[PDB]
């Protein structure tokens, strides 16, 4: 490249012809020639004719080199048009990434990337550095995309859908190579974005408290917390900024360095509000309203009520359930109806994805079985009904009772149990194959070698399975 | 004997292993429930019926400056972030 | 261990108020409402087995009838003079919840203990050394006599 | 037109953040092009990033001659497309005849220097006298004629760079033959346009630049690490 | 040899898990492919990739 510039620049009649000088040393990697001996003497800067160029860099992977016109100016703004992106997008996009693009449509669909789909699928038949971004990265290009992300505005958005995206793009699995390179890169963006946040935390907290809300006037469609949930990023908000702005929120008006036995005890004792033992740093109806309006208090008062209401399930099922309904069970009734008002409203503020956590379905069911069992306990004057209507009230009982678990995972101490206990089932599932396995083989085989001709069923399944069963729990078959 | 005391050892190395993402793991299930509880402006649980009606009554009847200055904010650190990169 | 006695408890409740509601109707002693919904469930932690549920190993020479005296009341019964209860939905209860706290709750606490053993232990000798403080101090603070003798000084 | 490498991207955005945190005035040329662009940029961003705490002036000292779109009131104007840049808090702009006029306002911002530098303001540590430097990074017959326009008087302070056009041509030297043999070495695509009856005022402009040494200084090649411009001033 | 790192690396695992699924593409969900087992003539369908 410097013997092909020694002959193009002394040939003294293309000494005016820097273009192509700049075009000889874009085709080659010639960055530091370019930049010492072309833009040195600021002698012919014309600042709108370097577009050709700029699209060559691009569709050639010349990074510096696009580095190096940024730095002696061009707007990108200016720069794109939708003839630039349909080009991009039409010719210059693979066909293998499309094909895995399709591929993470079918089998892996999400959010942003029906987002990205649709707008792939725009450009291939109004933010212009955020496309051309979502181009850069999605072809695994991994140093334009850094060039281009330094000029950004919304930049930790920007690094958290592109962390989504390739962490969405890897999980296809045919061409594990590119799998792997994704996997790279979104591990990349998403310690980019992190260390950015921490330190736009590090110098100013409301104004980074400001950054964590905001839209972008549909970046994707959503917000920057948001982007860094659907990633299951969690470590994005492990991070003691976004657990002091969480912590800040739920504690609300009441500052968080005053203790809780203090809290729990001004909710106990109501008129106790106006008195100087708690601390609403972060007139006396003021403080009231402080007070009642917080997600801890209001919270707690709704873990009392709900203690209450199973007091009042277990005294009417076991003590006092008539063939008529007393005072009792219409209480019960109507609280009931406030836990279902309750429901029914977080089922239509959220949708279909209600029924995507656990918790919400066995939620429903409780409330069904509840109204299946007034159902059967209506019908009086049916001995067999009403005790139906009674079975159906206890099995009910123990699914409400089990509820109270979730409910108590909101604490310091046995918060991370509780979650912790979701992640032995797989090895109770192992137990229980083996054990099953085991079971099954010597209660059959002392079955056969005892007895003969077993005709009945229930007396086959209490001396094949229940039995080695018990035997679990040290029983010893007799 | 030998079956349980398995299963022992199975969750005892489940807990030796998950138990430094258990935290992380926990803090990131807080912000659901610190979403649900701050996304409605709510009374007390067994009045919210109330406000029921009232979200009922509802349906009886019926670029920004700023963020650019905190979105130009945000440039400064980002420029003096990656100094550092650059510095390290 | 609180963790153990939380998760214990709630289970143990679910289980002992589903048991005497499936099985007998409107007891009106509370002493035989504890026995049953708290303290039997309790002893299934050690290995029990929670009893009246079975119908072919119930006797009614252990019932009452109505509370007159000191044994509990009868599952109530048929117009048949036979029990109620299915065996369908009260044998595979006491098999889960029996599954639930002797093996799974039990072997958890263990897993939780060993965990935390292996933690503490590097700094154990260091908080032990440095509870040693406070018993010197409090032995070489006080110039004393031998124990029984103290009273005289 | 103006060619900024990163060194001189850091070495700038130091000067201003010394500028503000010393409280500082800087005196430019106030156009929209170039040096004065990212002046201005690092001036709003150190504004941007704090809001309070000396919010620090930058004036800018215009032609008018040059100035594009011309609006005379009492009332604001609105300049939209010389042009002049957006992020200078002050601007002045000086008078005179027909268009084709530069290096009119050096008269006055000389003045000006000299008045401030016989300014007499006792709560300080030069001993009063408002200290005043006065820094060349480029090229071109204006900053070979405001550096001997400082020099010339007392209490300039100049400092010059290490890369540049008339910045190496002063940091490399420290008569008339060396200061040819320099000058057609660091800038020959420009002397084939000059004539020799300026080139001799030239070597006399910088004679009396090196009359005094000792009121200028450099910053070199092996001078590039960080707090390099605080050593310098 | 007992040489248990060759095969532990993902391209001989990659190997092998397209030999095992065989025919059918390796990214479609386990599910999908017993549901077909158990109704045979739902073979026709466009459930299952064949890629
Ligand atoms: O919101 C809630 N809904 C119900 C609920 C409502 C209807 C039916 C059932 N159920 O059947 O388990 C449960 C459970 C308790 N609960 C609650 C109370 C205090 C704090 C946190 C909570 O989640
Ligand atoms: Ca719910």
């Not at chain 4, 430019?28 to 941007?48: P, S």
């Amino acid at each position: 490249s410097y013997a092909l510039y020694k002959a193009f620049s002394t040939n003294e009649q293309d000494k005016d012809n820097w273009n192509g000088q700049l075009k000889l040393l874009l085709e080659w990697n010639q960055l530091d020639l370019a930049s010492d001996e072309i833009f040195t003497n600021d002698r012919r800067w014309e600042s709108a004719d370097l577009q050709e160029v700029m699209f060559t860099a691009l569709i050639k992977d010349r990074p510096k080199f696009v580095r190096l016109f940024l730095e002696n100016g061009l707007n990108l703004q200016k720069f794109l048009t939708n003839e630039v992106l349909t080009e991009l997008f039409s010719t210059h996009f693979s066909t293998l990434v499309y094909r895995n693009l399709q591929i993470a449509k079918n089998s892996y669909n999400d959010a942003l990337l029906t987002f990205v789909w649709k707008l792939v699928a725009n450009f291939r038949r109004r933010h212009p550095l955020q496309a051309l971004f979502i181009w850069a990265i999605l072809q695994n290009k991994k140093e334009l995309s850094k060039v281009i992300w330094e000029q950004t505005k919304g930049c930790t958005l920007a690094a958290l859908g592109a962390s989504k995206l390739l962490k969405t793009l890897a999980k296809v699995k045919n061409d594990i190579n590119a799998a792997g390179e994704s996997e790279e890169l979104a591990n990349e963006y998403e310690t980019r974005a992190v260390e950015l946040f921490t330190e736009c935390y590090s110098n100013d907290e409301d104004l980074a408290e400001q950054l964590l809300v905001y839209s972008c006037e549909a970046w994707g469609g959503s917000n920057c917390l948001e982007l860094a949930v659907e990633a299951t990023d969690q470590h994005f908000i492990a991070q003691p900024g976004v657990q002091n702005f969480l912590s800040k929120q739920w504690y609300g008006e009441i500052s968080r360095d005053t203790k809780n036995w203090k809290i729990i005890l001004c909710l106990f004792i109501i008129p106790l509000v106006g008195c100087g033992l708690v601390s609403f740093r972060k007139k006396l109806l003021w403080y009231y309203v402080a007070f009642f309006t917080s997600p801890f208090v209001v919270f707690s008062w709704n873990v009392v009520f709900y203690i209450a209401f199973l007091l009042l399930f277990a005294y009417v099922l076991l003590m006092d359930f008539h063939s008529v309904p007393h005072t009792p069970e219409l209480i019960l009734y109507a609280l009931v109806f406030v836990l279902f008002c309750d429901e029914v409203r977080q089922w239509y503020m959220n949708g279909v994805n209600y029924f995507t956590d656990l918790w919400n379905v066995m939620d429903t069911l409780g409330l069904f079985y509840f109204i299946a069992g007034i159902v059967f306990r209506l019908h009086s004057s049916n001995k067999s009904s009403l005790y139906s209507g009674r079975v159906i009230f206890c099995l009910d009982y123990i699914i409400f009772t089990l509820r109270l678990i979730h409910i108590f995972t909101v604490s310091r101490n046995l918060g991370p149990k509780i979650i912790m206990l979701q992640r032995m089932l797989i090895d109770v599932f192992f137990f229980l194959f083996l054990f099953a396995v085991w079971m099954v083989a010597f209660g059959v085989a002392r079955q056969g070698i005892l007895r003969q001709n077993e005709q009945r069923w229930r007396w086959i399944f209490r001396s094949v399975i229940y039995e080695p069963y018990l035997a679990m729990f040290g029983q010893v078959p007799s | 004997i030998l079956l349980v005391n398995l299963l022992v050892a199975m969750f005892g190395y489940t807990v030796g292993i998950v138990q430094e993402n258990n935290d992380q793991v926990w803090k990131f299930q807080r912000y659901f429930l610190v979403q649900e509880y701050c996304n409605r402006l709510n009374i007390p649980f067994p009045f919210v019926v109330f406000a029921y009606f009232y979200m009922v009554v509802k349906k009886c009847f019926k670029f920004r400056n700023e963020d650019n200055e905190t979105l130009a904010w945000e440039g400064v650190m980002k420029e003096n972030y990656l100094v550092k990169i650059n510095t390290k | 261990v609180f963790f153990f006695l939380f998760l214990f408890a709630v289970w143990m409740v679910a289980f002992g108020v589903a048991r005497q509601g499936i099985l007998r109707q409107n007891e009106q002693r509370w002493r035989w409402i504890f026995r049953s919904v708290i303290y039997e469930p309790y002893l299934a932690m050690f290995g029990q087995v929670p009893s009246d549920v079975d119908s072919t190993t119930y006797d009614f020479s252990h019932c009452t009838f109505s509370g007159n005296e000191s044994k509990p009341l009868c599952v109530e019964l048929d117009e048949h003079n036979l029990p109620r209860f299915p065996e369908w939905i009260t044998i595979p209860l006491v098999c889960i919840y029996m599954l639930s706290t002797n093996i799974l709750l039990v072997n958890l606490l263990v897993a939780m203990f060993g965990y935390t053993v292996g933690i503490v232990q590097e700094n154990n000798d260091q908080v032990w050394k440095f509870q040693r403080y406070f018993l010197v101090q409090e032995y070489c603070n006080r110039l004393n006599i031998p124990f029984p003798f103290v009273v005289f000084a | 037109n103006f060619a900024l490498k990163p060194r001189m991207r850091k070495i700038f955005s130091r000067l201003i953040y010394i500028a503000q945190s010393k409280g500082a005035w800087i005196l430019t040329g106030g156009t929209h092009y170039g040096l004065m662009k990212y002046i201005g940029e690092v001036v709003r961003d150190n504004t941007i990033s704090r809001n309070s705490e000396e919010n620090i002036v930058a004036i800018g000292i215009a032609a008018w001659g040059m100035v594009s779109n011309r609006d005379t009131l009492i009332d604001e104007g609105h300049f939209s497309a010389y042009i002049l840049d957006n992020n200078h808090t002050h601007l002045l702009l000086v008078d005179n005849g027909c268009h084709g006029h530069p290096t009119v306002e050096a008269k006055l911002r000389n003045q000006l220097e000299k008045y401030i530098s016989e300014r007499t303001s006792q709560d300080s540590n030069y001993g009063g006298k408002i200290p005043i430097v006065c820094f060349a990074q480029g090229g071109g017959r204006e900053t070979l004629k405001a550096i001997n326009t400082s020099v010339k008087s007392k209490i300039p302070c100049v400092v010059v760079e290490g890369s540049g056009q008339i910045a190496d041509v002063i940091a490399s030297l420290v008569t008339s033959s060396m200061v040819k043999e320099k000058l057609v070495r660091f800038l020959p695509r420009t002397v084939s346009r000059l004539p020799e009856e300026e080139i001799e005022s030239w070597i006399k402009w910088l004679k009396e630049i090196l009359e005094s040494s000792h009121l200028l200084t450099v910053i070199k090649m092996e001078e590039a690490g960080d707090e390099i411009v605080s050593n310098a001033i």
